[PDB]
Design a protein around this ligand. Structure first.
Ligand code: ZN
Ligand code: ZN
Lengths: 186, 141, 78, 242, 385
């Protein structure tokens, strides 16, 4: 409901929806080609992309708001994983900004980067191809596992007929406590 | 403001000592006054403005002591304190007590009770304060 | 600590069997015991091996009473 | 208790006030200023450093944008074009552009800052780098008149003070841009005037005049109550005082 | 009923009708004479009470139901000689050392460390305005009969806050205290305000500084209104006056903005006695359509013979906060009379200039505009405070 000057929302936040859609669909294309969307709920990713747009069209004031604020004005129940999706796409736009000369010299941060979104997405494809040559994989397994699927020891031997008989010498109760096995569960 | 820096201590000491004497007579209270020379409080390089606000707040605090739920002896002592405070100041014009509407009728009832109790000292002192018109008719002290 | 020791001890008496210990444990479900076993198998495998070679008996009575006495003791001392 | 501060009635949901009224709209058309415009904030050293960083950022981006846009367009053309000799020419142009980027990166910060009268994207800084806290004209003036390094920030020398005083009367104490130019030490009109006024006998009235005495007496008698008088608020009416 | 009580301790009180409150106060005082404006007899030493004994003892006996001899004994007992530890010839500038008071001990501690050559002075204690405007009017009487305060008239203490709030502190406020009568209308209070918002001017005159606007804000707009218990009191005596409250009622009542339904009424239709107002609870007044003022009814009481009985001074100012003059940035010591924007010479925008620092800087001997700038005449609120 940000496309209308409803009294419940300040007019500061109203924007043309066309540029909104363009920014959002190119942001989610960026997310898609960077392996973010596969195997995950799309809805939080779309919400995060709408976020990056909404801050990008007017960082002058909108950079100060957070997730709960925007979903309050929009009257939307944001998913819990939305914040994590946001964080990982910030990781991605940092990896994407390191390539550009002006950004890599300016020493930007998580918050300050939002104002250059148009600049990066104007030249997305070549830069993301360069960023691939340093792909994306789940951070959990990107912890540099030195050992991958260690081979377990071979223990298919079964013995001849009975490797032991003492294991059966545990599986039975002597009558001392078998007798009284009927008067606590009653 | 609240309270002057130290007036509450002196007032409490005076009132407690007077209550401990187990006397309602005005004489014993005046002997205490002249013993500790409480009347000298209004000197000491107080300019007229500072004197005015000090007297206003002192009368307000002594009136707070004068109001219930304090018992008969302590209320009588507080009335004596109000009398001497108003009668020993050096302001021009003499600053008056602040009295609330909710307190004026109750204080009149207390004066009537003092008259009925035959303890005419406090009743006469209140009538002298009334003659001096030592009370503003405010809404709160 | 005590609850872990008793989980072991019962695993020796009633074996690697969870619903009965959940039943005799006042407030443990079978999924809870299964999760304890997942957590403990990585380190206490030797003790669980000790759980399957001795033939000491099992009860409700002697045990039920032993449980309640040690739980009361632990709760009053903890 | 503290919630009733101005505006007295504020929207509970959004904090917005009422829309513009007739009287306020007519006042704005007539150009009458409000008492909220006189609130001016001094420049903290933090703020000055931030603006210096912003200016160097603007100069870096201005220098880089044509070059890096050219590089990106060249790379796109090289990707799309399959002709070998044209590909090699585009690659050579890309190498040249990359060397230009490297040279610009190696340029010093002072060279980036450039001259005092160089163009800047003042609105962009005002709204995006200072989040609209300070207006674009405000930061532009402050930079170009006090903060740019080319400005003479050094303390006045005694010879400079005496020459300023001598040449102030040459122009009649008027047109202080010309006085600063004649001084020859790269001072501006405002600094020269400030120094002169701080050391102008005609301004700091050690003297007395009949009209000042008469009007001082009039205002004191009009306002004074008892022993309290507006000792220095009369200065607004009588010139050359504090 | 109209029984004042604290809504919050020492902060604000319950709402009550001023007229009914005054009627209740008079009912507890009418006929008694304690609310009269005539000078009553005062207490004295027992050595001089003989002259007043004839007039006092009979009344004391009547009121206390005691005998005349008992009244005389009470008078002798309650003499001031028993209470006057200070003789009438003793100056108040020196602490009497023959005392046991903790208060005087703290006073001595304050005074001892202020007797050095660096610290000894007779400067202000903490404020000056209150006593200066008290003694100037306390106990005085008017020169005209029509300016006589009615006996038993209500005295209302009203605090009006300035438009320039500190916006850095919240305990203390910038305000001036006005004393008004119960029978007075709100019109005489509104017309008595001397706020700088009435003196605002504008217009851009960098090219011709001498063509400043002829009419001050007071001569162009006259809209002003009070706001008490949800009621707006809008002036309409002049064509320049407009009912601003209609715009507020249109904006606020269209949505749940946190305030209830209001009503519109004229400014001259009510007196101070007709109000049902709280004490200490802030209220709203506005004028010029943008200058809002915080209104606090600090105190209300019946008139006393020792009070200011001169109505020519009413509305009587008794307390006033101070605002500091906005001085120009050129000489950094003189109060500004002009403000400029887009000024090439000025180091910052906006920049404040005084006439002396303005005319000769922005103009040559012939008055020709120099450089690029925009200039506006300026009135200092810190001066006309
Ligand atoms: Zn005003
Ligand atoms: Zn000047």
């Amino acid at each position: 409901k940000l496309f209308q000057a409803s009294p419940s929302v300040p007019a500061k936040y109203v924007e043309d929806k066309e540029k909104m859609l363009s920014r959002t669909m190119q942001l989610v294309e960026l997310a898609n080609e960077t392996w973010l969307v596969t195997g995950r709920h799309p809805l939080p990713v779309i919400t995060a992309a709408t976020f990056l747009a909404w801050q990008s069209l007017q960082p002058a004031d909108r950079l100060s708001c957070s997730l709960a604020r925007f979903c309050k004005l929009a009257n939307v129940d944001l998913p819990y994983p939305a914040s994590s999706r946001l964080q990982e796409l910030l990781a991605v736009l940092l990896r994407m900004a390191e390539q550009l000369a002006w950004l890599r010299v300016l020493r930007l941060d998580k918050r300050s980067v939002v104002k250059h979104i148009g600049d990066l997405l104007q030249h997305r494809q070549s830069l993301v191809r360069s960023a691939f040559r340093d792909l994306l994989l789940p951070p959990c397994m990107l912890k540099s596992p030195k050992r991958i699927c260690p081979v377990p020891p071979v223990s298919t031997v079964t013995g001849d007929e009975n490797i032991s008989d003492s294991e059966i010498e545990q599986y039975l109760r002597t009558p001392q406590e078998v007798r009284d096995f009927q008067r606590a569960q009653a | 403001m609240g309270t002057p820096p130290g007036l509450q201590t002196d007032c409490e000491a005076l009132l407690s000592r007077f209550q401990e004497t187990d006397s309602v007579r005005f004489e014993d209270f005046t002997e205490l006054w002249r013993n500790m020379k409480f009347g000298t409080i209004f000197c000491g390089r107080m300019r007229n403005l500072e004197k005015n606000m000090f007297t206003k707040e002192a009368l307000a605090l002594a009136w707070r002591y004068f109001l219930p739920p304090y018992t008969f002896q302590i209320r009588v002592g507080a009335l004596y304190l109000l009398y001497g405070l108003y009668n020993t100041q050096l302001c021009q014009p003499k600053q008056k007590i602040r009295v609330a509407l909710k307190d004026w009728d109750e204080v009149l009832k207390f004066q009537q009770d003092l008259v009925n109790a035959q303890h005419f000292d406090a009743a006469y002192i209140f009538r002298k304060l009334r003659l001096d018109r030592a009370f503003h008719f405010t809404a709160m002290p | 600590n005590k609850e872990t020791d008793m989980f072991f001890l019962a695993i020796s008496m009633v074996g690697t069997d969870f619903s009965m210990i959940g039943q005799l444990f006042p407030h443990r479900a079978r999924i809870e015991i299964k999760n304890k076993f997942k957590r403990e198998e990585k380190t206490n495998g030797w003790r669980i091996d000790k759980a399957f070679q001795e033939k000491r008996p099992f009860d409700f009575d002697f045990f039920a009473h032993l449980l309640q006495k040690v739980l009361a003791e632990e709760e009053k001392r903890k | 208790m503290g919630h009733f501060m101005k505006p007295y009635f504020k929207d509970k949901v959004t904090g917005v006030g009422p829309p513009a009224n007739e009287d306020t709209r007519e006042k704005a058309a007539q150009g009458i200023k409000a008492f909220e415009e006189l609130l001016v904030t001094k420049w903290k050293n933090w703020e000055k450093a931030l603006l210096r960083k912003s200016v160097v950022s603007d100069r870096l981006q201005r220098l880089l944008q044509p070059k890096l846009l050219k590089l990106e367009y060249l790379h796109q053309k090289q990707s799309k074009v399959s002709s070998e000799l044209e590909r090699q020419a585009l690659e050579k142009q890309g190498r040249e552009a990359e060397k230009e980027i490297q040279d610009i990166n190696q340029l010093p910060e002072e060279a980036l800052l450039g001259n005092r009268l160089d163009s800047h994207d003042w609105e962009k800084i005002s709204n995006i780098n200072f989040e609209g806290s300070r207006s674009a004209e405000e930061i532009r003036k402050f930079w170009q008149n006090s903060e740019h390094p080319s400005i003479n920030k050094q303390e006045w020398s005694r010879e400079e003070e005496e020459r300023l005083q001598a040449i102030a009367a040459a122009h009649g104490h008027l047109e202080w841009q010309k006085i600063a130019e004649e001084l020859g030490t790269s001072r501006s009109a405002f600094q020269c005037l400030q120094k002169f006024q701080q050391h102008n006998k005609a301004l700091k009235r050690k003297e007395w005049t009949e009209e000042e005495d008469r009007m001082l007496t009039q205002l004191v008698q009009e306002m004074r109550v008892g022993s309290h008088i507006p000792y220095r608020r009369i200065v607004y009416y009588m010139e050359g005082r504090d | 009923c109209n029984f004042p009580e604290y809504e919050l301790p020492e902060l604000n009180t319950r709402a009550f009708h001023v007229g009914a409150f005054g009627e209740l106060w008079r009912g507890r005082l009418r006929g008694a004479g304690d609310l009269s404006l005539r000078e009553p007899p005062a207490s004295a030493l027992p050595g001089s009470q003989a002259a007043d004994s004839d007039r006092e003892d009979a009344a004391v006996a009547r009121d206390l139901d005691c005998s005349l001899e008992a009244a005389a004994e009470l008078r002798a007992v309650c003499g001031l000689d028993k209470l006057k530890c200070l003789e009438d010839g003793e100056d108040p500038e020196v602490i009497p050392e023959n005392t046991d008071l903790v208060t005087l001990g703290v006073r001595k501690r304050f005074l001892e460390h202020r007797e050095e050559t660096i610290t000894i002075d007779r400067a202000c204690r903490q404020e000056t305005f209150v006593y200066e405007m008290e003694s100037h009017a306390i106990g005085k009487k008017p020169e005209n009969s029509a300016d006589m305060i009615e006996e038993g008239e209500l005295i209302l203490s009203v605090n009006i806050l300035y438009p320039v709030i500190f916006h850095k502190h919240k305990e203390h406020k910038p305000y001036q205290t006005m004393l008004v009568l119960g029978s007075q209308k709100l019109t005489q209070l509104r017309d008595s305000i001397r706020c700088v918002s009435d003196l605002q001017i504008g217009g851009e005159f960098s090219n011709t500084p001498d063509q400043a606007p002829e009419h001050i804000s007071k001569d162009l707009y006259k809209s002003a209104f009070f706001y008490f218990e949800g009621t707006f009191y809008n002036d309409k005596r002049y064509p320049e006056c407009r009912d601003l409250s209609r715009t507020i009622i249109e904006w606020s009542e269209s949505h749940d903005r946190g305030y209830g339904k209001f009503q519109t009424a004229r400014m001259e239709d009510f007196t101070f006695n007709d109000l049902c107002i709280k004490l200490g609870f802030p209220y709203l007044y506005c004028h010029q359509g943008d200058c809002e003022h915080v209104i606090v009814i600090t105190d209300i009481r019946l008139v006393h013979h020792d009070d200011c009985l001169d109505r020519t001074l009413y509305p009587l100012l008794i307390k006033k906060h101070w605002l500091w003059t906005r001085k120009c940035f050129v000489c950094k010591m003189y109060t500004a009379r002009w403000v400029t924007n887009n000024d090439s010479f000025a180091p910052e925008d906006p920049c404040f200039f005084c006439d002396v620092c303005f005319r000769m800087l922005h103009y040559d001997s012939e008055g020709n505009k120099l450089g690029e700038f925009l200039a506006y005449p300026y009135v200092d609120p810190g001066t006309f405070n």
